Amino acid sequence: ACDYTCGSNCYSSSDVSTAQAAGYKLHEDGETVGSNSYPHKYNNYEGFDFSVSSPYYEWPILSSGDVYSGGSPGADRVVFNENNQLAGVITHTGASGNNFVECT
Numbered sequence: 001a002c003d004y005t006c007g008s009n010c011y012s013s014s015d016v017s018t019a020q021a022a023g024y025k026l027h028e029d030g031e032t033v034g035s036n037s038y039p040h041k042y043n044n045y046e047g048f049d050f051s052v053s054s055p056y057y058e059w060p061i062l063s064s065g066d067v068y069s070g071g072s073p074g075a076d077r078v079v080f081n082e083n084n085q086l087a088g089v090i091t092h093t094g095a096s097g098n099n100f101v102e103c104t
């Protein structure tokens, strides 16, 4: 079974930890990757009820199982905070335009 399901993409907690660690390392070093400069601030325009405190940062999680290194980021992201605490997993899949919905 999937710990997180983003549309048709299935992720386990290990997938999430792995992606999160990569994104957090970049954030800590002050470096970015890709044209959209990941990781970057996630403003939470959606108003999600994350149980962990802001600020939040977005970082793509890929269905291929590889860590993001540039190029298309797909529709899924791992949201973490300043303390490397997972806030949640979100996706553009199933949401209109550039909005997000939570992965179930």
Ligand SMILES: Nc1nc2c(ncn2[C@@H]2O[C@H](CO)[C@@H](O)[C@H]2OP(=O)(O)O)c(=O)[nH]1
Binding pocket: 036, 041, 042, 043, 044, 045, 046, 058, 098, 099, 100
């Ligand atoms: N929908 C949404 N997009 C956000 C938020 N914070 C930052 N973004 C970024 O703001 C821009 C317009 O929605 C996009 O570049 C999106 O980036 P991503 O595609 O990387 O998520 C947020 O809270 N909600």
Ligand SMILES: [Ca+2]
Binding pocket: 094
């Ligand atoms: Ca739906």
